[PDB]
Every structure is written in C-alpha cells, then in structure tokens.
Design a protein around this ligand. Structure first.
Ligand code: HSM
Ligand code: CA
Length: 213
C-alpha cells in the first residue's frame, strides 16, 4: 500500500516539480495536443521557472512524498486566484491560459467572493511518470484531500479550478465540486478568429469547478 506525506513547497524542489509537471503535461495535456506542432517541453519549464520564487513564497503549494522511498511522487501548485503572478508567455501556451481566463474570469470576478485570501486557485497538479494506476489514483486522492486541508487551514473560502481531462473532471465531481461552467473547447475563438482547439471532439470539455470549504 502506498503511504504518502505532504510537504510544503521549498526552493530546492524546483527540478523535481518541473520534471513531474513536464512529464505530466507534455504530449499528455488535453488542450495543448491541438496546438501541435510547436508545444515544447521547455514551454512548461519556462513558465514554472518564472514563477518559482513567488510560488514558494506564497506558501500554498506542496509536494507529496512516498514515505517508503522518501521520493516525490506528486505536486499541487496553488495560488490565491486574486493574487497570481502574470508571466508574459512567449510560447503557444499563451492561448491555453487565455482560454482558461475566458472560462474563469467572468465567473471569478462576478460570482465568487471578492477580496484576497478567498479563492484558492488550483493552478496545476501532477504525478510522477513511473506511478502505476493504483499509485496514480491513490496520489490524486491524497492530493485532493490535502488541497482541502490547505484551503481550510489558510482560511480560504473555497477551491477554484478548471478541469480539462476526464479523470480530473470526474474526481472533482465525486469530491462534490460544483460545476460553474461546462465549455465545449472546440467552440473557443482566438483573437484572430481561428479556433485553436477546433479539431477536438465535441465531447472534450473544460469544466470550471468550485468547492466551498
Ligand atoms: N488547470 C487547468 C488545466 C490545464 C491545461 N493545461 C494547463 N493547465
Ligand atoms: Ca484540478
């Protein structure tokens, strides 16, 4: 049985967190697959490197250790939704973030509580590549449990995330996240009139989830 411990993010975790996020997203992420070609592994690591110091300073993020091997198997990256760094993104990931803001912005700024320390934004999650399905499932349950604990302990009102894969969408639902938007990703229109995810099947959704704590 997999037994785990959540440790707050520290400055020396940078490369381990990057390796997990890159391995967890590059050529796997459900939105970026439609921007091919031109999704580079360094596009993800460039973003994390720009935000790394503030990410650690805000003290809302954590890694998950396997306490039997003392190695990191997962990580949850969080910010206050109203107090997030903005990075100029020179990569094609900028369209993903603009799409996510298209989903989140209207809901966040007009329907969720105003002020800082209200909305805990679950920004990225990931698990190590070598985890088998039992370990992956267990680590995701452990990270969801721990995001809730951080939210309560840090006195946030709730947890806000856009879930873009079927697994994270279904996990959100069994953890009783409320659906605020279920958007068909192939209908999103970029500023140049194109549809960057237009080739995606009609069934691929971006679901904006919210859970009060
Ligand atoms: N949490 C938003 C899902 C996502 C996709 N790509 C990057 N992030
Ligand atoms: Ca999520």
């Amino acid at each position: 049985m997999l037994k785990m411990e959540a440790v707050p993010l520290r400055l020396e975790h940078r490369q381990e967190v990057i390796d997990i996020i890159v391995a967890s997203f590059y050529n796997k992420a459900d939105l970026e697959q439609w921007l091919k070609p031109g999704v580079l592994r360094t596009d993800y690591s460039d973003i994390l490197n720009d935000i790394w110091n503030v990410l650690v300073e805000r003290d809302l993020s954590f890694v998950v250790y396997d306490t039997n091997t003392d190695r990191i198997i997962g990580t949850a990256l969080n910010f206050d939704a109203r107090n997030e760094p903005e990075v100029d993104i020179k990569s094609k990931l900028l369209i993903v973030f603009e799409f996510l803001e298209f989903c989140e912005g209207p809901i966040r700024d007009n329907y969720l509580p105003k002020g800082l320390n209200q909305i805990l934004h679950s920004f990225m999650m990931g698990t190590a590549e070598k985890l088998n399905p039992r370990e992956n499932i267990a680590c995701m349950h452990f990270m969801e449990h721990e995001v809730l604990r951080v939210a309560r302990e840090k006195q946030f009102a709730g947890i806000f995330t856009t879930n873009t894969s079927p697994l994270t969408q279904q996990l959100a639902d069994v953890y009783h996240y409320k659906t605020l938007l279920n958007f068909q990703v192939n209908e999103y229109v970029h500023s140049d009139g194109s549809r960057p995810f237009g080739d995606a099947p009609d069934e691929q959704r971006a679901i904006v989830h919210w859970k009060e704590v």
